Amino acid sequence: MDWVVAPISVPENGKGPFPQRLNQLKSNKDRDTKIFYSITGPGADSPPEGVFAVEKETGWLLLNKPLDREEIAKYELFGHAVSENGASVEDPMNISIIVTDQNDHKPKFTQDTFRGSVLEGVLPGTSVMQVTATDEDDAIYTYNGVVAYSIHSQEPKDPHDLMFTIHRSTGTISVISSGLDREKVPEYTLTIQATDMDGDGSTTTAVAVVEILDAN
Amino acid sequence: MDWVVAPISVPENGKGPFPQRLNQLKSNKDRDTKIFYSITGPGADSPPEGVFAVEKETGWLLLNKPLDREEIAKYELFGHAVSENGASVEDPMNISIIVTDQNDHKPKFTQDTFRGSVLEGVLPGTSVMQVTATDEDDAIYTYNGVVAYSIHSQEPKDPHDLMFTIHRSTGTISVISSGLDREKVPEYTLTIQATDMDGDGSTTTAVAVVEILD
Ligand SMILES: [Ca+2]
Ligand SMILES: [Ca+2]
Ligand SMILES: [Ca+2]
Ligand SMILES: [Ca+2]
Ligand SMILES: [Ca+2]
Ligand SMILES: [Ca+2]
C-alpha cells in the first residue's frame, strides 16, 4: 500500500535544528544496484538555491534553514535516482513542500481614526460606516489571519450605553437603538478593536468618530 | 520512486472545512481486484473514536474535526485493504499523523510576586534568584512555547538605574553593578516580563522583590 501523492507540510519559523530531515526517498531498484539521489527545482538548484538538499546515499530530504510562508508558501521540486553505472533508472519524482502558517503577524487597522455620519432619525439596523484591519497571515486554512472586530467603549454614554454595534467579521458599524439627537449629543467616539485568531490572538486598537446630522 | 515512510503533519485548530481530505491510499492490487479501504487505531476505532475516517472506495483519509496538539500530539493508525471477501490482500500500512503546534497559549508567570535576597558585598555577575513563566505550546520544534525574559523597570534608581539584569532564556536574575548598601537601599522592586515566540509574541508581567542583606 502507498499514498498516491504525499506532500510535506512544514511549519514556517521552525527551530530545527538545521539541517532538518523531512522524508526519505527510496528507489525500488535498491537491490539490483547502488543508487545515488539528488534534487532540482526552485528551492534546490534554481533560486532560491540550497534551501533544500538531499543526502546522496541515504535519500533523506533535508531542509537547510527556517522557512517564511509570507515569502514563499509552496515549493515544487524533483527527486532523481541514478545507478552507480550512471544511468537514470526511473522517472524523476514530484516533491511538493507546503509551508503552513504561523501567527507571526499582528493585525493592523488601515487608519488610526475612521469617520462617519448618520441622520438623527434613523431606524435601528442602519449602516453607519465600515472599518478595516488587515493581517498578513493565512486566513483560509488557519485563524491566524482571521480578524474579529469589537467595540470596546462609547463616549459619551447617553442616552444609552450601547448605541452602536459592530459586525464581528465585516467591520460594518450599525445603529442599534433610537434616540439619536444632534442637539443633545452631536458626536460619538467609539474605541474599536481588531483581534486575530478570530478573537483569541493579539489585539490592536483604533477609533471611530460618528457625527450625528440634523433631519431639519 | 517513493517515500520510505511519509507521516502527515496537520496544524492544530484548522479551518477545514470538515471532513477534510489528507492523503489518499492505494493498493497495487487495484488492477486485478476490487478493493475496500478502512482504518483502525486510537483516533479511528479506539478512543478517541471517529476523529479520522476513510472513504471505503476512493481510499481518501479524512480528518473529521479540528485537532488540539495540547490534547493529543501524535496519532498512530493502520490502513487496511480488503477484497470483497473482507480478507486482507496485503500488510496493513502504518499511518503517522503529527499534530503541529499553533501559538494558542499565552505565557504565565508561576507567581505574581517572586522574592529573593543578596548580600550587599557581592561581585557583579552574582546570581540572586530565578523567576519562571510557563507556556503550554511547543518549545521544541516551534518558538510558540519559548519564553523570553526581560526587566521592564527598577525602583528605586539608586545608586544607579541598571543594578540587575535577567538572563533572557533562563529567568535567572543577576547583579551587574557594585554599590549595593542595605543602609542606603534595603529593597528593590523589579517589574519583569515574559514574552513567548522568543520575544515576538504575547507578553505577561510580574514582580521581583530583592532584599539586600547586611
Ligand atoms: Ca513569516
Ligand atoms: Ca504567518
Ligand atoms: Ca495574525
Ligand atoms: Ca490547542
Ligand atoms: Ca499550541
Ligand atoms: Ca505560546
Side-chain angles (χ1 to χ4, degrees):
Chain A
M1 208 167 324
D2 232 297
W3 306 111
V4 320
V5 191
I8 315 176
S9 289
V10 181
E12 65 170 340
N13 312 331
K15 274 187 75 185
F18 301 96
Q20 171 194 142
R21 286 181 165 184
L22 298 174
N23 289 170
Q24 188 180 23
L25 294 170
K26 196 161 199 162
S27 181
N28 285 168
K29 313 194 177 268
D30 267 318
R31 304 178 289 144
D32 302 348
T33 36
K34 171 81 178 179
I35 301 289
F36 294 93
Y37 301 95
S38 53
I39 49 170
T40 57
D45 66 354
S46 336
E49 304 196 345
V51 177
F52 304 84
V54 167
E55 290 177 14
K56 15 156 173 114
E57 260 170 311
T58 66
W60 275 104
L61 178 61
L62 297 181
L63 171 60
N64 294 323
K65 74 195 188 73
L67 304 167
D68 174 4
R69 191 195 68 76
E70 285 78 39
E71 192 178 359
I72 293 179
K74 196 148 65 64
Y75 297 82
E76 297 300 331
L77 310 168
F78 304 100
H80 309 271
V82 316
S83 67
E84 66 198 301
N85 276 191
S88 176
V89 296
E90 58 191 301
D91 282 327
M93 186 186 114
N94 289 187
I95 299 165
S96 296
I97 308 297
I98 301 175
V99 187
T100 62
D101 188 53
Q102 285 293 346
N103 197 25
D104 57 355
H105 291 269
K106 297 182 158 70
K108 288 301 150 176
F109 276 107
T110 62
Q111 316 165 199
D112 283 356
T113 306
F114 299 83
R115 302 189 181 276
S117 66
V118 65
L119 286 166
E120 66 188 358
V122 299
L123 296 177
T126 305
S127 278
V128 180
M129 61 199 289
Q130 183 168 42
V131 301
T132 315
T134 54
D135 196 295
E136 293 327 274
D137 296 317
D138 169 12
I140 296 171
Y141 310 114
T142 84
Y143 298 105
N144 295 337
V146 174
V147 168
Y149 296 104
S150 66
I151 298 171
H152 188 252
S153 50
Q154 175 191 300
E155 279 293 327
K157 314 245 187 308
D158 46 65
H160 188 50
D161 181 16
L162 318 162
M163 291 241 43
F164 308 87
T165 198
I166 192 160
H167 193 294
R168 186 168 194 288
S169 64
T170 70
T172 300
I173 295 173
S174 286
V175 177
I176 56 163
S177 68
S178 58
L180 290 169
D181 180 26
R182 176 171 176 81
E183 282 116 71
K184 278 258 127 75
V185 185
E187 194 188 69
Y188 292 90
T189 296
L190 308 182
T191 304
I192 49 170
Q193 279 176 154
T195 302
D196 66 4
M197 282 193 253
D198 197 20
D200 299 337
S202 332
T203 306
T204 186
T205 306
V207 162
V209 176
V210 190
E211 203 170 12
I212 309 302
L213 307 167
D214 196 64
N216 73 249
Chain B
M1 208 168 324
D2 232 299
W3 305 110
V4 319
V5 84
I8 315 175
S9 290
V10 181
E12 64 170 339
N13 311 332
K15 276 185 75 185
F18 301 96
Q20 170 193 142
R21 287 181 164 184
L22 298 173
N23 289 169
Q24 188 180 24
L25 295 171
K26 195 148 207 217
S27 181
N28 282 170
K29 315 195 179 268
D30 253 356
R31 181 213 207 94
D32 285 350
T33 150
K34 173 67 176 178
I35 303 291
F36 297 93
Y37 301 95
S38 52
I39 49 170
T40 57
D45 66 355
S46 335
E49 305 183 313
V51 177
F52 303 85
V54 168
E55 290 177 13
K56 56 161 170 99
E57 303 213 3
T58 66
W60 275 105
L61 177 62
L62 297 181
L63 171 60
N64 293 322
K65 73 195 189 73
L67 304 167
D68 173 6
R69 190 195 69 77
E70 286 78 39
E71 190 181 352
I72 294 178
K74 196 148 64 65
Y75 298 82
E76 297 300 330
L77 310 168
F78 303 100
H80 308 271
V82 307
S83 60
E84 191 155 278
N85 222 262
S88 285
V89 298
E90 57 188 302
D91 282 327
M93 189 183 108
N94 286 187
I95 300 166
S96 297
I97 309 296
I98 300 174
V99 188
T100 63
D101 188 53
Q102 286 293 351
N103 197 22
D104 58 353
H105 291 270
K106 298 183 160 70
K108 286 294 128 72
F109 277 107
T110 62
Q111 316 165 199
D112 283 356
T113 306
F114 298 83
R115 302 188 181 276
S117 65
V118 64
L119 286 166
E120 66 189 357
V122 301
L123 296 178
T126 305
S127 279
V128 181
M129 60 199 289
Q130 184 167 36
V131 301
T132 315
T134 53
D135 195 295
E136 290 314 297
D137 297 317
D138 172 8
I140 297 171
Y141 310 112
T142 86
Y143 298 105
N144 296 335
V146 173
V147 167
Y149 296 105
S150 66
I151 298 171
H152 187 251
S153 311
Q154 176 192 300
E155 281 297 330
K157 300 187 187 308
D158 218 72
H160 58 265
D161 188 17
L162 288 309
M163 297 281 334
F164 309 88
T165 198
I166 192 160
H167 193 294
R168 186 169 191 288
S169 65
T170 70
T172 298
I173 294 173
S174 287
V175 176
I176 55 164
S177 191
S178 61
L180 290 169
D181 181 30
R182 176 171 175 85
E183 285 130 73
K184 211 76 163 144
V185 185
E187 193 188 69
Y188 291 90
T189 296
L190 308 181
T191 306
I192 50 169
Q193 279 175 153
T195 302
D196 67 2
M197 281 192 223
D198 195 24
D200 301 332
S202 343
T203 306
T204 185
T205 306
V207 162
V209 177
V210 189
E211 202 185 340
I212 309 302
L213 307 168
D214 206 326

